[PDB]
PDB file of C-alpha atoms and ligand atoms in Angstrom:
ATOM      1  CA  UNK F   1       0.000   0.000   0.000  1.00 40.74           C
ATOM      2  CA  UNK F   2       2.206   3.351  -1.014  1.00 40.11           C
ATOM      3  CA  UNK F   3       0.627   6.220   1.084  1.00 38.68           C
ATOM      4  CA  UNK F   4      -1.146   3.993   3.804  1.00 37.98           C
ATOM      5  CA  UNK F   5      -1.182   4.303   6.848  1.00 37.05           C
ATOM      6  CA  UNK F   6      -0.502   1.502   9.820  1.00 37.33           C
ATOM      7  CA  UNK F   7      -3.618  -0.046  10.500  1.00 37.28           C
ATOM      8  CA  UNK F   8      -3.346  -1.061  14.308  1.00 40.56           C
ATOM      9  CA  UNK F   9      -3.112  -4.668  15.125  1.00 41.36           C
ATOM     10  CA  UNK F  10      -6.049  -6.963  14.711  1.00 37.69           C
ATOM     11  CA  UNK F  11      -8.460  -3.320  13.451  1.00 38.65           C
ATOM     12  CA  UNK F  12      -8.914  -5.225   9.585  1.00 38.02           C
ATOM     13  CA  UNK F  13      -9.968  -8.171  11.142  1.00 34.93           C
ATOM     14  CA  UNK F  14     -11.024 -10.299   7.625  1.00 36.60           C
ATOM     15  CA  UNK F  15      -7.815  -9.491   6.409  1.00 40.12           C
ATOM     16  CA  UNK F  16      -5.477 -12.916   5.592  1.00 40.78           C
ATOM     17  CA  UNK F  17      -1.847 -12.985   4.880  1.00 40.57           C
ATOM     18  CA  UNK F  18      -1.231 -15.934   2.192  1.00 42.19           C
ATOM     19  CA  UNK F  19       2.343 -17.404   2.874  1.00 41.48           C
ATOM     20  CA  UNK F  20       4.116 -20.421   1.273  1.00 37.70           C
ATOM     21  CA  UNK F  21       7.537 -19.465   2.889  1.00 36.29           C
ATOM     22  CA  UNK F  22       6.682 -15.876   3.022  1.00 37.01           C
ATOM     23  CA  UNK F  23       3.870 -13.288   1.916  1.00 35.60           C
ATOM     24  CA  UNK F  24       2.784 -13.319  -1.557  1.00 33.74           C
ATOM     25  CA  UNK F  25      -0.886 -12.280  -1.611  1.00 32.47           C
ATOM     26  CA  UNK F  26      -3.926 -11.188   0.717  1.00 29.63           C
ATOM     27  CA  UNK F  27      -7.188 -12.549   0.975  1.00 23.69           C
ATOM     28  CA  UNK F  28     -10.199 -11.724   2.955  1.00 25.01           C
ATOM     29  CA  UNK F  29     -12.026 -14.090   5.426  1.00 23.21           C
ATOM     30  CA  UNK F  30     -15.649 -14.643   4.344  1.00 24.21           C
ATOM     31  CA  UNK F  31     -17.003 -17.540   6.819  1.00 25.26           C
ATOM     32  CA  UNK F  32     -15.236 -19.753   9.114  1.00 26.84           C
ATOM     33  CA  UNK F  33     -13.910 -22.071   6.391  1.00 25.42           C
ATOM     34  CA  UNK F  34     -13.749 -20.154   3.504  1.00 30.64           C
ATOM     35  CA  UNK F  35     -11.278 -17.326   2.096  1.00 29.49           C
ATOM     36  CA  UNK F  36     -11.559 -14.944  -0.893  1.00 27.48           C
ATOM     37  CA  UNK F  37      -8.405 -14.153  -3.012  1.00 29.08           C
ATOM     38  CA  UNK F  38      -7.313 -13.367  -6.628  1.00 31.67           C
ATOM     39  CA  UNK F  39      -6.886 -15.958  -9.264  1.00 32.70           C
ATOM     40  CA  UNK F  40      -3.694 -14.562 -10.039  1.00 31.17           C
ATOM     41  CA  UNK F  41      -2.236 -15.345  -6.298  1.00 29.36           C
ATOM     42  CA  UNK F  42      -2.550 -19.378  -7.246  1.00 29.69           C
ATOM     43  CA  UNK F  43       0.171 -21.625  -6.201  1.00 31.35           C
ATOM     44  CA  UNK F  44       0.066 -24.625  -4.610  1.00 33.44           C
ATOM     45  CA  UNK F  45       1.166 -25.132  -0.952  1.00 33.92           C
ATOM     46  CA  UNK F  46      -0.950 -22.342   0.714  1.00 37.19           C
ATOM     47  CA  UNK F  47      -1.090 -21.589   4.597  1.00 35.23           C
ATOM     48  CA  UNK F  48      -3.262 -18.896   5.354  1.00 36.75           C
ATOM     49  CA  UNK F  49      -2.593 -17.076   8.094  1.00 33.07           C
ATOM     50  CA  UNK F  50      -5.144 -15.156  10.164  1.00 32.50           C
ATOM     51  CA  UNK F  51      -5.089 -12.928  12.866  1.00 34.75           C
ATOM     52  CA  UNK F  52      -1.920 -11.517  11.967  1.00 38.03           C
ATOM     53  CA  UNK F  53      -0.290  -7.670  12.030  1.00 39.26           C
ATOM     54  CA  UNK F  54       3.328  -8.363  12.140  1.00 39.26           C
ATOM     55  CA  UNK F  55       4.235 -10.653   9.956  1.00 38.97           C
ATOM     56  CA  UNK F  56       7.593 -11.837  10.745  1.00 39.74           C
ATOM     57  CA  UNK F  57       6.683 -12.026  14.428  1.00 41.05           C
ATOM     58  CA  UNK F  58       3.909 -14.432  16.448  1.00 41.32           C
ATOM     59  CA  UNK F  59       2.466 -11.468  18.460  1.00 41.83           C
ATOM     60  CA  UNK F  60      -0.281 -13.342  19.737  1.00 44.09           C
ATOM     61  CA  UNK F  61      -3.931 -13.826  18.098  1.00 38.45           C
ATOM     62  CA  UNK F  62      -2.563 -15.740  15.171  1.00 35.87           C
ATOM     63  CA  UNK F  63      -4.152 -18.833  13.371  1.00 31.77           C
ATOM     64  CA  UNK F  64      -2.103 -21.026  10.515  1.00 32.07           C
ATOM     65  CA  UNK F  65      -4.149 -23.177   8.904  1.00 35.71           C
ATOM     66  CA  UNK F  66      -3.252 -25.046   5.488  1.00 32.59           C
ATOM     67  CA  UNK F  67      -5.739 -24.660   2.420  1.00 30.09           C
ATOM     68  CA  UNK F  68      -7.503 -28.057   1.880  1.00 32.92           C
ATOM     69  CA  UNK F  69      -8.214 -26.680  -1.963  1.00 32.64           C
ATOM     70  CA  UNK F  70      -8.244 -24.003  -3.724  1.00 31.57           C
ATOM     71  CA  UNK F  71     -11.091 -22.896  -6.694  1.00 32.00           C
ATOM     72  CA  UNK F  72      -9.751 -20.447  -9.410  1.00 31.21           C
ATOM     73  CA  UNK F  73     -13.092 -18.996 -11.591  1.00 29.05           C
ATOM     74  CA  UNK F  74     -13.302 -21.153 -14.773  1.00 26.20           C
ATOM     75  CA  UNK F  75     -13.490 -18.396 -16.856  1.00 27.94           C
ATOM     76  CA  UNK F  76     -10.235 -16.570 -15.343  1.00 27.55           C
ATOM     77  CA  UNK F  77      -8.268 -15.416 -17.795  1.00 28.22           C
ATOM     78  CA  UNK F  78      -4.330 -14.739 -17.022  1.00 27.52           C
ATOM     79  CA  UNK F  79      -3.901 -12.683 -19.968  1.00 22.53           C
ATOM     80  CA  UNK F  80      -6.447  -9.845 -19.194  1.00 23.80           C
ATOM     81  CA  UNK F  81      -6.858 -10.940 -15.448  1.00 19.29           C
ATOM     82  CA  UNK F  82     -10.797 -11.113 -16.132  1.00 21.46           C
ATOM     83  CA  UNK F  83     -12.682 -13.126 -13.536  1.00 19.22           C
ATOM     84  CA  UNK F  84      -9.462 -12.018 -11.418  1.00 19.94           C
ATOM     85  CA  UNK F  85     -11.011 -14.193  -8.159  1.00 13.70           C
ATOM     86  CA  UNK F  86     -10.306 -17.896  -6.639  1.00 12.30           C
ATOM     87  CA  UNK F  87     -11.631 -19.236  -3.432  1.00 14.41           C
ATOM     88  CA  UNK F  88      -9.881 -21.029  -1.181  1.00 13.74           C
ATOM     89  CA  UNK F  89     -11.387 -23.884   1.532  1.00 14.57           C
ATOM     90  CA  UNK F  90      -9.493 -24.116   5.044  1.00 19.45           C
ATOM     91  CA  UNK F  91      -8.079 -27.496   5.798  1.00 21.43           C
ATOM     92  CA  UNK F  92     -10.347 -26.746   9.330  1.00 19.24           C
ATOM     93  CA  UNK F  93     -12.368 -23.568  10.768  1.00 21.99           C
ATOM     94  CA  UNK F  94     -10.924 -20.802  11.961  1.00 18.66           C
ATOM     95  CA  UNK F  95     -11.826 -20.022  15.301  1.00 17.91           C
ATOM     96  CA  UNK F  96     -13.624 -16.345  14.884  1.00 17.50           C
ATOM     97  CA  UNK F  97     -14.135 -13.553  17.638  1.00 18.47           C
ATOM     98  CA  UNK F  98     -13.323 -10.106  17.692  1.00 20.20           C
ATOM     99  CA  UNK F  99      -9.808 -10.214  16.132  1.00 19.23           C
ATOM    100  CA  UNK F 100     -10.428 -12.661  13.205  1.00 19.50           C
ATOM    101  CA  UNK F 101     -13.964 -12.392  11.717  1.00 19.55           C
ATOM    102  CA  UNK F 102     -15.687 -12.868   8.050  1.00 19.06           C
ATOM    103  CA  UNK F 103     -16.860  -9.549   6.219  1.00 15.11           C
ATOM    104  CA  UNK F 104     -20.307 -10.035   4.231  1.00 13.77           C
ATOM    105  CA  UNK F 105     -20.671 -10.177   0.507  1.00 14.16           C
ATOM    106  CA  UNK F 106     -22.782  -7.420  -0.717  1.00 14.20           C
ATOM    107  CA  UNK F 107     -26.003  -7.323  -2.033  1.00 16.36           C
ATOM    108  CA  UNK F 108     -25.720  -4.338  -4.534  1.00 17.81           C
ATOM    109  CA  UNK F 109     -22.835  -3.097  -6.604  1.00 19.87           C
ATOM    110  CA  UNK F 110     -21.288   0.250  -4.693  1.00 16.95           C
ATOM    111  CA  UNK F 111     -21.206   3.662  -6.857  1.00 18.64           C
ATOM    112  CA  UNK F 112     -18.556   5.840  -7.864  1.00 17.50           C
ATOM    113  CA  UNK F 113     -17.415   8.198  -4.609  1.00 16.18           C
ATOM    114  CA  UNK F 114     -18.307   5.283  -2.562  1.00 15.12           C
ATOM    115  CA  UNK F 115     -15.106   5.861   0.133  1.00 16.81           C
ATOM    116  CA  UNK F 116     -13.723   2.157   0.735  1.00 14.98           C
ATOM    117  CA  UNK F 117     -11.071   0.617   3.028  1.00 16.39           C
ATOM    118  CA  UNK F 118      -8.038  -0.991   1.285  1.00 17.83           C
ATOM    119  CA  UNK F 119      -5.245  -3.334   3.280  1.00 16.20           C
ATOM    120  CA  UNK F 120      -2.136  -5.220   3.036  1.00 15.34           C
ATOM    121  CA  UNK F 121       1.392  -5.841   3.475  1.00 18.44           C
ATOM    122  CA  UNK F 122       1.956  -5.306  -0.241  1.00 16.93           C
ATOM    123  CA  UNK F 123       5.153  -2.776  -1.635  1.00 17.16           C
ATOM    124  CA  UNK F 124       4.884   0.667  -0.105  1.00 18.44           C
ATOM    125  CA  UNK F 125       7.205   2.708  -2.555  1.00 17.68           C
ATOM    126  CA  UNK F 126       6.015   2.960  -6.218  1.00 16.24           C
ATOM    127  CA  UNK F 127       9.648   3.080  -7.211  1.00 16.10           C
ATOM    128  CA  UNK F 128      11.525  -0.063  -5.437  1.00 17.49           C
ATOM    129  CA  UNK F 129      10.387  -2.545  -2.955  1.00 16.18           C
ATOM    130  CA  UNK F 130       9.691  -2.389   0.501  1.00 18.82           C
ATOM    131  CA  UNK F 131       7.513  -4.134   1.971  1.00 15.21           C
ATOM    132  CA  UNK F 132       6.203  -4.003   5.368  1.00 15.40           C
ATOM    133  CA  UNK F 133       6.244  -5.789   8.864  1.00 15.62           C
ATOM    134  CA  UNK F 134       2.775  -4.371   9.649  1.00 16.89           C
ATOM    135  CA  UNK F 135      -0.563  -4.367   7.984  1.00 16.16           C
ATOM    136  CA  UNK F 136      -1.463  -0.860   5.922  1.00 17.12           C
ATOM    137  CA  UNK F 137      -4.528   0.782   5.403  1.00 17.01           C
ATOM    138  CA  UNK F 138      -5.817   2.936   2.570  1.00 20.15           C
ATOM    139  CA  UNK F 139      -9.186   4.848   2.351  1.00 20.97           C
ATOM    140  CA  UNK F 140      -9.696   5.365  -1.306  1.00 21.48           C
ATOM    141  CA  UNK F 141     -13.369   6.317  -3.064  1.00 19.41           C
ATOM    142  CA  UNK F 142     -14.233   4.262  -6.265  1.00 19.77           C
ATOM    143  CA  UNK F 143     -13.820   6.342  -9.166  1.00 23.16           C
ATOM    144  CA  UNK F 144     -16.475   6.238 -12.521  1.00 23.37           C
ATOM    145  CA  UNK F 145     -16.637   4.316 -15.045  1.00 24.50           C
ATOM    146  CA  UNK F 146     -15.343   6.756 -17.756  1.00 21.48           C
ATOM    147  CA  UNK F 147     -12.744   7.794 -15.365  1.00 22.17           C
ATOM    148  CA  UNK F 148     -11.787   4.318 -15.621  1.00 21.53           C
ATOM    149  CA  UNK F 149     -12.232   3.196 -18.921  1.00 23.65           C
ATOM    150  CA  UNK F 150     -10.041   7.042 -20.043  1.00 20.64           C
ATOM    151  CA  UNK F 151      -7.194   5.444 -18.032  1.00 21.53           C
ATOM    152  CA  UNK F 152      -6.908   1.986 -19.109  1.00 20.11           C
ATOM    153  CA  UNK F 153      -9.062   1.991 -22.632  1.00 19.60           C
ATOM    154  CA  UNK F 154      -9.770  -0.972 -23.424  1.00 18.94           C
ATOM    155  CA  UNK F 155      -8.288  -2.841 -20.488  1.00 17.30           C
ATOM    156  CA  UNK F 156     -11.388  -3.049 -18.634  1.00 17.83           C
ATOM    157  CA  UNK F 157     -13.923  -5.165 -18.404  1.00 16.86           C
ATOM    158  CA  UNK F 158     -17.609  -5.205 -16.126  1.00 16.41           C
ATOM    159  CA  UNK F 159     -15.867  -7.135 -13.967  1.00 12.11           C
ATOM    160  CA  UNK F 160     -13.262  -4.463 -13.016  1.00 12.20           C
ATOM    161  CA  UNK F 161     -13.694  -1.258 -11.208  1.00 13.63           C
ATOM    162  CA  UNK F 162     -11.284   1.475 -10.184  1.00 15.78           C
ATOM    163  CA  UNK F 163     -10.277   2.945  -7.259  1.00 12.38           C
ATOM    164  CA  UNK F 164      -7.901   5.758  -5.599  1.00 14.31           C
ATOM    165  CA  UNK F 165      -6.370   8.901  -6.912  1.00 14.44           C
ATOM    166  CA  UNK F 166      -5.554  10.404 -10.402  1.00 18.42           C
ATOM    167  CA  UNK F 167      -3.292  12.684  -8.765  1.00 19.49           C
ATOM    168  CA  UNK F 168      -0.807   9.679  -7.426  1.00 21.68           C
ATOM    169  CA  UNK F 169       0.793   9.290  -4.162  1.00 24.10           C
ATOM    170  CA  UNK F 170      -1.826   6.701  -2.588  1.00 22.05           C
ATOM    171  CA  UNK F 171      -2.534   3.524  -4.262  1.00 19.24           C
ATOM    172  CA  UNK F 172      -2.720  -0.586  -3.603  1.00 18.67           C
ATOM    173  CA  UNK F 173       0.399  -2.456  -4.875  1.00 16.29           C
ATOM    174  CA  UNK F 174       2.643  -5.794  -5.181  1.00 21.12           C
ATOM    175  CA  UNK F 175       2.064  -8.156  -2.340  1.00 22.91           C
ATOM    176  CA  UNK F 176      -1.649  -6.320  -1.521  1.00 21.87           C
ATOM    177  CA  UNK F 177      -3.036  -8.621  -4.605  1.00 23.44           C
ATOM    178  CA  UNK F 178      -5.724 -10.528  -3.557  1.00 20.68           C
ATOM    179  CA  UNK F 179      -6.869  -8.469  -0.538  1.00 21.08           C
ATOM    180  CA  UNK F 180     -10.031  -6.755   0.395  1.00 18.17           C
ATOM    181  CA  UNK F 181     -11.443  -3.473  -0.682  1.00 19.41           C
ATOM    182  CA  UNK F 182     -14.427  -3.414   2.013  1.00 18.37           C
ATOM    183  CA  UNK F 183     -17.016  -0.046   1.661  1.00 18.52           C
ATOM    184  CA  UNK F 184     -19.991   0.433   4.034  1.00 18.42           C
ATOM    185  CA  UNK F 185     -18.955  -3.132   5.403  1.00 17.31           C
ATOM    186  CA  UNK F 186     -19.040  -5.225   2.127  1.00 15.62           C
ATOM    187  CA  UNK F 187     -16.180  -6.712   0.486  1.00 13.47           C
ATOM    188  CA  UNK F 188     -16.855  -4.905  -3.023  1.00 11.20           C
ATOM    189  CA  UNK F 189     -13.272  -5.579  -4.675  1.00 11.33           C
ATOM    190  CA  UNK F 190     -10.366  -7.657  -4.959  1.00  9.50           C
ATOM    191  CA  UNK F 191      -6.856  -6.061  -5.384  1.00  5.16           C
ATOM    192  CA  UNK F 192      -5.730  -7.012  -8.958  1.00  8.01           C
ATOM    193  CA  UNK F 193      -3.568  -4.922 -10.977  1.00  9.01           C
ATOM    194  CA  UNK F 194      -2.948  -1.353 -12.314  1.00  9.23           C
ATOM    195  CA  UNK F 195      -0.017  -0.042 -14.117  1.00 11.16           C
ATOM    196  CA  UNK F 196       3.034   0.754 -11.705  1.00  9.92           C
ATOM    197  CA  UNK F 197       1.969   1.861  -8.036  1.00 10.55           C
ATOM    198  CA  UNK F 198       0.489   5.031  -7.188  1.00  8.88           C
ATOM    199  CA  UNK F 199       1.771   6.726 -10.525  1.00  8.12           C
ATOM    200  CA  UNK F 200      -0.579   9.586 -12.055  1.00  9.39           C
ATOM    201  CA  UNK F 201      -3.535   8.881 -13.893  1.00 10.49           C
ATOM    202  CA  UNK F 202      -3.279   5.424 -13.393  1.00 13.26           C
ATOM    203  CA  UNK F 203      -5.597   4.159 -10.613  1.00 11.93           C
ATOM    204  CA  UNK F 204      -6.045   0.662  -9.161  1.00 10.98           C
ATOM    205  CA  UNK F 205      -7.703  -1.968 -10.792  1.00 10.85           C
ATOM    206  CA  UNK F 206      -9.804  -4.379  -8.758  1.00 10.61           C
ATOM    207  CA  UNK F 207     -12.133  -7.259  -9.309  1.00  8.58           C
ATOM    208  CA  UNK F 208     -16.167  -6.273  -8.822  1.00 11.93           C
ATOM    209  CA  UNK F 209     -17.190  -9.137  -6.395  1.00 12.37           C
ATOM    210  CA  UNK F 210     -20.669  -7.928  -6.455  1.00 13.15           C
ATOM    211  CA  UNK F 211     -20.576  -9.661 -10.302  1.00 12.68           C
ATOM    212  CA  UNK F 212     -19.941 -13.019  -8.357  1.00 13.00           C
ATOM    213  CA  UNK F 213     -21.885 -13.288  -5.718  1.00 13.30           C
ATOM    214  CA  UNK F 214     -24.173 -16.144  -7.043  1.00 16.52           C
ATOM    215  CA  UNK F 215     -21.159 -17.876  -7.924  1.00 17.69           C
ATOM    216  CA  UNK F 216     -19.516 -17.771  -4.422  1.00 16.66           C
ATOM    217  CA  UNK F 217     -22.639 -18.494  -3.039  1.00 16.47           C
ATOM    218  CA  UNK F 218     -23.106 -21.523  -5.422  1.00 18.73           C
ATOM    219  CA  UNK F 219     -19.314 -23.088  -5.145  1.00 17.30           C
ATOM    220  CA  UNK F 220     -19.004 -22.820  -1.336  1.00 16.65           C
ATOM    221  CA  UNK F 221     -22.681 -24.912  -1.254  1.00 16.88           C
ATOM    222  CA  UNK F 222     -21.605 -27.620  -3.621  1.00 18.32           C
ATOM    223  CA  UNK F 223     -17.622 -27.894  -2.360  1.00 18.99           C
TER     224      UNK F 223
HETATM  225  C1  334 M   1       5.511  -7.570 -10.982  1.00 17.74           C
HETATM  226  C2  334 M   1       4.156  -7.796 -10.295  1.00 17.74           C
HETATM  227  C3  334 M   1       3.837  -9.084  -9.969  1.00 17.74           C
HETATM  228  C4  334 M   1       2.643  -9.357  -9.365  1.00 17.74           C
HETATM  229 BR1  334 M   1       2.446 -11.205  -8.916  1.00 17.74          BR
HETATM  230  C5  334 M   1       1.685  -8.389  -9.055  1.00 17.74           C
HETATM  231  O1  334 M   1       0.464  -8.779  -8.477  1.00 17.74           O
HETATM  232  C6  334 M   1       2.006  -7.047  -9.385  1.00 17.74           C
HETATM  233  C7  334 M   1       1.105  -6.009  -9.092  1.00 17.74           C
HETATM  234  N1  334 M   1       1.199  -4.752  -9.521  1.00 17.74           N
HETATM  235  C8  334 M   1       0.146  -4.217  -8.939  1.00 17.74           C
HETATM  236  C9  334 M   1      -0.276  -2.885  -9.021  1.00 17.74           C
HETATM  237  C10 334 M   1      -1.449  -2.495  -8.320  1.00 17.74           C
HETATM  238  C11 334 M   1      -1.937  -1.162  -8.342  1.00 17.74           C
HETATM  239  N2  334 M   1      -3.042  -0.883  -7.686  1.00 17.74           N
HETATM  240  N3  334 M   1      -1.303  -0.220  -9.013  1.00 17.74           N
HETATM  241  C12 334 M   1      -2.132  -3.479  -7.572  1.00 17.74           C
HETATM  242  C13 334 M   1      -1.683  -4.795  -7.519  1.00 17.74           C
HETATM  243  C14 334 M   1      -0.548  -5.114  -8.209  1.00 17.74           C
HETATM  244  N4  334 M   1       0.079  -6.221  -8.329  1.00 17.74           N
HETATM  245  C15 334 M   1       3.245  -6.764 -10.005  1.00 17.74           C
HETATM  246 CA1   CA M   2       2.626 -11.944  13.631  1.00 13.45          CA
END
């Protein structure tokens, strides 16, 4: 996240870390078995860690728990990163309470100038790598649909929206992929992509969950 701001330990409570050996991707927690994540943060030999702030330190409040499977959409496509979303089943439940607990799907799409919540341990420098010890937070409105079809023409698809600041400075970035972008309590996006990190004119990227809500729904009944 470049222009975050530290979160405070265990105040994002959905938010996962995904770690085969160390962070690669975010995810948000949805029920007590289940986990939310981009397609694009597939690998195999997931442990999903919950709970956490720090993460190169057990602080305390901390779950591991290995994924039993993973479900990319079937209509994911690497090349445009439509359908950017996979699911991902926890070998067991996570124990849930105040510090680790699901956010709610939502039930309508959310409108440009919606203000939304954005988190992760992902790259805070848009020039060079570094990456964080502590979960980062972002508030960041979703921005129209011309707005985001004049940045990225023809690079978008219904199943994108985007999100932050034309001017620059304050965006999501490597290592957030994957994570939540929660407004009025909802998840409503996905990290995904965008073109560099916080650069001008070219605002986040991130996966419209409200498009899949019958198929989350659906795949969590039948799995
Ligand atoms: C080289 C590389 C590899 C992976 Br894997 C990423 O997910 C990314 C990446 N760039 C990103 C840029 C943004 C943004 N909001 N500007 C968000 C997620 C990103 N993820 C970059
Ligand atoms: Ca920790």
């Amino acid at each position: 996240i470049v222009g975050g701001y530290t979160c405070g330990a265990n105040t994002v409570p959905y938010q996962v870390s995904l770690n085969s050996g160390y962070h690669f991707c975010g995810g948000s927690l949805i029920n007590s078995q289940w986990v939310v994540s981009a397609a694009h943060c597939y690998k195999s030999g997931i442990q999903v860690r919950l709970g956490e702030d720090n993460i190169n330190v057990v602080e305390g409040n901390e779950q591991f728990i290995s994924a039993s499977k993973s479900i990319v959409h079937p209509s994911y496509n690497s090349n445009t990163l439509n359908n950017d979303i996979m699911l991902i089943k926890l070998k067991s439940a996570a124990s849930l309470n105040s510090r680790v607990a699901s956010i709610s799907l939502p039930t309508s799409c959310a409108s440009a100038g919606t203000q939304c919540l954005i988190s992760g341990w992902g790259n805070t420098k848009s020039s060079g790598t570094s990456y964080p010890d502590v979960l980062k937070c972002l508030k960041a409105p979703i921005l129209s649909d011309s707005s985001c079809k004049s940045a990225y023409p023809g690079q978008i698809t219904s199943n994108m929206f985007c999100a932050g600041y034309l001017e620059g400075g304050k965006d999501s970035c490597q290592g957030d992929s994957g994570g939540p972008v929660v407004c009025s309590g909802k998840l409503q996006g996905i990290v995904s992509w965008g073109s560099g990190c916080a650069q001008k004119n070219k605002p986040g990227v991130y996966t419209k969950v409200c498009n899949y809500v019958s198929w989350i729904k659906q795949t969590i009944a039948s799995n």
